[PDB]
Amino acid sequence: GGTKTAAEAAAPAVHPVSGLQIVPVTVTGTSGRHVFRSELARTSAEQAKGLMFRTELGDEEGMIFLRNPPDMATFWMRNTVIPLDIIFVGLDRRVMNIAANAVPYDETPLPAAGPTLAVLEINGGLAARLGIKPGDKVEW
Template structure:
């Protein structure tokens, strides 16, 4: 095999591997064997901003909210333009409550809140319909990727 043939084979191999590496980078969570790329909201400012003013979330994407303490939570959809599933997890990363198909509240007024009804430390927001599609039940466990800080 000539050097140019070898070089071409190496370049092709890296070209085939790079898309897999790129999709595997960044923060992720797994739920019922499905992986979601997530943005992390782990301080007051990021949690307050959440998914406000977004036009779409994207397939296989979500936002993970990390709180310092496990306690009853309540989220609302102020200035949110996309319907979401809001999934509440306790400190052991077990699903303790679900608010499915939560409608947007794009004008930011008279937005109802959606409580956890159980103490939660982590909240995962996904596109509306994901919880139904995956047939999520309370008690399911979420797995965090290695870059998500553990308490």
């Protein structure tokens, strides 16, 4: 029985900048259970915009990219001002790979390991601080 994280239990909301739905996303593994209130990017265009232009993001926040079909994803940091960790999630809802410390404005492609069901973006360096690793279960 874990401590009840208020962010996990709170109803979905709407982001005041993007208008996107905010939903709770959990990441669970050996390090424990982590919770991110995440903007939900679904359309191809929503996913192409990502977190471009944003100048701040809380450690408690993220953006979740939900993909159907779950085509292999490749990301970049054009117009992205803040560093991010990009967590790629496979078809079993487990983390495949992480592009850690993706660099602001960097156009270098950041590929998923394979067919990508979801992507979770959180603040740069946070995955390692938290202990999030490939194999961890991501739920939304």
